[PDB]
Paper text:
GDF-5, like BMP-2 and BMP-4, binds to and oligomerizes two types of serine-/threonine kinase transmembrane receptors, termed TGF-β superfamily type I and type II receptors. Whereas BMP-2 binds to both type I receptors—BMPR-IA and BMPR-IB—with similar affinities, GDF-5 exhibits a 12-fold higher affinity for BMPR-IB than for BMPR-IA. This type I receptor specificity of GDF-5 is due to a single amino acid, Arg57, which is located in the pre-helix loop of the ligand. Mutation of Arg57 in GDF-5 to alanine abrogates type I receptor specificity completely, whereas the mutation of Arg57 to leucine leads to enhanced binding to BMPR-IA and attenuated type I receptor specificity.
Structural studies were performed by crystallizing the binary complex of GDF-5 R57A bound to BMPR-IA and determining its structure at high resolution. Analysis of the two binding interfaces formed by the homodimeric GDF-5 and the two BMPR-IA molecules yielded a total of 18 intermolecular hydrogen bonds (H-bonds), suggesting that polar bonds play a role in GDF-5 type I receptor recognition and binding. With regards side chain rearrangements, the largest changes were observed for the two tryptophans in the wrist epitope of GDF-5 R57A; Trp33 moved downwards by about 4 Å and Trp36 rotated from a highly solvent-exposed conformation into a position located above Trp33 thereby moving by almost 10 Å. In complex with GDF-5 R57A, the α-helix of BMPR-IA formed similarly as seen in the complex with BMP-2, consistent with the observation in the study of Klages et al. that small changes in the environment result in spontaneous α-helix formation. Although the structures of the ligands as well as of BMPR-IA were almost identical in the different complexes with varying binding partners, superposition of the complexes of GDF-5 R57A:BMPR-IA and BMP-2:BMPR-IA revealed that the orientation/position of the receptor ectodomain in its binding site differed between these complexes. From this comparison we determined that the membrane-distal part of the BMPR-IA molecules swiveled towards the N-terminal end of the GDF-5 R57A α-helix and further into the concave wrist epitope, whereas the membrane-proximal half of the receptor swung out of the binding site compared to the receptor orientation observed for the BMP-2:BMPR-IA complex.
Author numbering:
A (entry chain B): 31 to 118
B (entry chain A): 16 to 120
The structure:
């Protein structure tokens, strides 16, 4: 089911209209860690629209760059989120 | 990483060589949409399921599946007063003239 209202933290993925580094949505908040070329990693986070979220929130084991996304469904649930990479 | 978003695009009917036939306005802001559409596709990008699938596949093998594209997903009208009719004056509202939002499709 869709969520009338969900408030999430964002970083890297903030809408143009973000305030206090937060975004609104009807789907999920996410946090993602992804690994760069020299093996450097960034964490980023934002809001995910409901439609498409069952596909985006599960992760393809076959991504060309190792990464982990996590989704949750309560206000600000992604602040303080630390997914770690799949074990090498 | 500059991600899919609305950028400024100024239309000026004189530069277009259209000042001969458009009476008003002289110019408006139409905006345009440009930028990466990468995994993951955040909420304001409002992807279709297809855009999600294709993006995922492109994330898996970019040689084999190209990226989805940043494009207007919501627009608004502009009304233009012009001639062109063997010079009979005419008022017309044109839909989809100004980008209000961008997303990946």
């Amino acid at each position: 089911d869709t969520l009338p209202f969900l408030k999430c933290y964002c970083s890297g993925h903030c809408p143009d209209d973000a305030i206090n580094n937060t975004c609104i949505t009807n789907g999920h908040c996410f946090a993602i860690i992804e690994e760069d070329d020299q093996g450097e990693t960034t964490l980023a986070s934002g809001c995910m629209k409901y439609e498409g979220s069952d596909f985006q929130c599960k992760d393809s084991p076959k991504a060309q760059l190792r990464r982990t996304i996590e989704c949750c469904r309560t206000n600000l649930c992604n602040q303080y989120l630390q997914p770690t990479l799949p074990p090498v | 990483k500059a991600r899919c978003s609305r950028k400024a695009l100024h239309v000026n009917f004189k530069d277009m060589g259209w000042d001969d036939w458009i009476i008003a306005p002289l110019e408006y802001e139409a905006f345009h949409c440009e930028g990466l559409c990468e995994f993951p596709l955040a909420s304001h990008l409002e992807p279709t399921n297809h855009a999600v699938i294709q993006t995922l596949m492109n994330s898996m093998d970019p040689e084999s599946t190209p990226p989805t594209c940043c494009v207007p997903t919501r627009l608004s009208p502009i009304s233009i007063l012009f001639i062109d009719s063997a010079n009979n004056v005419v008022y017309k509202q044109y839909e989809d003239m100004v980008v209000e939002s961008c997303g990946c499709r």
